[PDB]
Design a protein around this ligand. Sequence first.
Ligand SMILES: Nc1ncnc2c1ncn2[C@@H]1O[C@H](COP(=O)(O)OP(=O)(O)NP(=O)(O)O)[C@@H](O)[C@H]1O
Ligand SMILES: Nc1ncnc2c1ncn2[C@@H]1O[C@H](COP(=O)(O)OP(=O)(O)NP(=O)(O)O)[C@@H](O)[C@H]1O
Ligand SMILES: [Mg+2]
Ligand SMILES: [Mg+2]
Lengths: 403, 403
Amino acid sequence: AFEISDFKEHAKKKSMWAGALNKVTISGLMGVFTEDEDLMALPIHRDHCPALLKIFDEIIVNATDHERACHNKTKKVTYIKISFDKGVFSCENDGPGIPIAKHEQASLIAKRDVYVPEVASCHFLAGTNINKAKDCIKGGTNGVGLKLAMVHSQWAILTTADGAQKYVQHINQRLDIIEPPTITPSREMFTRIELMPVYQELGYAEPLSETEQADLSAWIYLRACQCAAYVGKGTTIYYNDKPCRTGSVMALAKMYTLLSAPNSTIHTATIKADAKPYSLHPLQVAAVVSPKFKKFEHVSVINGVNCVKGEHVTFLKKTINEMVVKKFQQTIKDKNRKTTLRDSCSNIFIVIVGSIPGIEWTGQRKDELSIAENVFKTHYSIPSSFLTSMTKSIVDILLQSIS
Amino acid sequence: AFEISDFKEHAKKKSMWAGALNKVTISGLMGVFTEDEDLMALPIHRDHCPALLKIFDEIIVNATDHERACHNKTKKVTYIKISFDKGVFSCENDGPGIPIAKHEQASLIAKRDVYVPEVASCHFLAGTNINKAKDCIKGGTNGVGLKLAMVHSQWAILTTADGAQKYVQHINQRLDIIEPPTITPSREMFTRIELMPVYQELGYAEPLSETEQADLSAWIYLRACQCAAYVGKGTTIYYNDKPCRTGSVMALAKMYTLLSAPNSTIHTATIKADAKPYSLHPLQVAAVVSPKFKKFEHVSVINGVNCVKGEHVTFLKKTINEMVVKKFQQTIKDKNRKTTLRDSCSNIFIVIVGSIPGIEWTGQRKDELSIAENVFKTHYSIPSSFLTSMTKSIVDILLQSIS
Ligand SMILES: Nc1ncnc2c1ncn2[C@@H]1O[C@H](COP(=O)(O)OP(=O)(O)NP(=O)(O)O)[C@@H](O)[C@H]1O
Ligand SMILES: Nc1ncnc2c1ncn2[C@@H]1O[C@H](COP(=O)(O)OP(=O)(O)NP(=O)(O)O)[C@@H](O)[C@H]1O
Ligand SMILES: [Mg+2]
Ligand SMILES: [Mg+2]
């Protein structure tokens, strides 16, 4: 039988939008746990629901998108408050709110009065990034993420104020009940999404178990730390009302390596480009090099997205490898052995944070960015001091393994 | 400005559907090249357009989906003819055709007469897999792939016959011109998609250059070889009218390793499960182990999809590693050295082909399958002879590297 579906039912049934709709093994799943005034990034060796993490992610990247959008403007985003308590998830930013105004074409379609936040939250393929510029470094592009959050919410509340009015709209039952909004005068300016996911439909206990709750809190806490490193310097990231410590890639590196390699040496670099638009967006990099690292490992926040695959990583890997091979054959008086990238890089843990204009993704989840490798070969340069430091640490480890 | 988009314009502008819409560096890009009656899988070190390869892939996986759907039936798919010539791309299968019948709800929506092939090819989120069963091993799930092919076609022709009628419909200008279909009597039974992509819009020369043409032909030829290993035994896969040789994972392994390691030993296993539905779908595996392999490498055809990431790989990796560590500490009289998965597996090239029921993906592209790791720990077993052979080859290589 041949069936025609709408966005709503499709997004509830299909994994192409946010990942699997039940618990699966997520490789590299991490969370932040507090051990006596110390943040540690630890693995979560338990299956979780990718789509569940995506609905947090979509709203968080919407907030960091607003922050970049306003950072060179008069009214800026000074904070991103994220909270997670008793299952309820909330995110609030303070730049200009979403325009409290009637959407003409959306109302013509709906045959009733529809305002912009209702389009932004309930209309698939809708937003301000349908026509993205080549220089735009927002993560958002599809006009889909927010509605993915709504469709996986038992209940949700969009609140937004623009300095003259406040606008409150309830969106319930997986986008099936869209209450008419309530518009009052207010002089506040902010955007807040507040929602309860459908934890049971997504494979979780109702309410969340002790372990599920702790795992999800740790994961969200981690995402907030990542924002705090990516976001600009006038913006505080809060999670459950505490500010997020990690405003630098060095802080992120220390967090991820607190256990494998405490008290270790952090190689740092700011990778710059010479031609606009790339020269507008330096990449911050911190790397630790340890013999007790078993494989190569990276953490990337690119355009606010915690993506796990992309040619920026390969750019750093290949550059470091070429230098490592040169100095290994120099330092070794054996002069015959041939090492490759796995030997070069398996003792490296690296953090890369920043914006890259003009990238594309392999799906809505934005797990993998898509780019020509030559973008980096043409435009970017890794500072030689960082390369030298790194090569030195790595060749030390190689020579001692063959010692 | 807040914009509302339709499927058509969205799919032309957005990379979430099929990948990047221009040329990017695709890691692991391979193609099949003929060298004097020998097929070799060689890297393509040139940027290509992921969405362009996806429109070939979508139709090819639709065909292998039909093949699985009909394999236990009376009228089977006996062939999948694929061709690529002068830019035109074509794919034809011979099971029962697409129902030549009026679609009621689609006609009610369109306010005119719409037949099932027009829904199948022009209506997003539409198909026979909107409600997939947990045991279904077709790649198709979203009701999207075929329309992605149409939207990236300057012109296309859907032809399908059901044994009493033939149905010809033209779909042109990136799904903007949908000509009314032409229905005649015929006693043939088949489905054919024939189309010209928008190579210029996707970053290519018009017409294709010598290198682009050769790269794309090699890549499609490779995909067909993969089908020929995945498809059932009554089904011939043709590419440009020649049959595709590689009906076994051993043939695939030899093709991929013809240069790095000719005349090499191929470890083979059929990984079975004991509980339905998994016991209905054995995984075929072929692996080569060579000192001149620089990193771990796999080729996977799962449910007809050439996916590149999934916990099936990790299942094999971890099992082989546990055995390799045991026998390494046994064979070594050093008895202290500790090796991990990278040491265990960096000399392995492995092919895994077959069906897995109940999997999910991370996006439409289906680059990565999503599953609980325990599915394999509970249900599947790797034959011990294969594990033993593999461990032996690997420990030989490790002992000679430390020799
Ligand atoms: N916190 C926010 N502050 C301001 N505007 C917002 C905020 N969240 C969402 N928006 C607006 O709502 C629109 C719709 O959001 P969304 O559905 O996530 O699409 P998107 O972020 O543009 N692209 P994508 O996330 O890739 O689907 C966005 O384009 C923004 O214009
Ligand atoms: N070669 C074919 N033979 C028979 N039926 C086909 C063939 N190609 C397509 N169809 C039918 O057309 C429908 C629509 O195709 P498609 O748009 O690719 O969706 P899908 O394959 O079901 N799921 P997806 O590919 O993940 O978007 C399919 O569900 C099939 O029922
Ligand atoms: Mg968004
Ligand atoms: Mg399909």
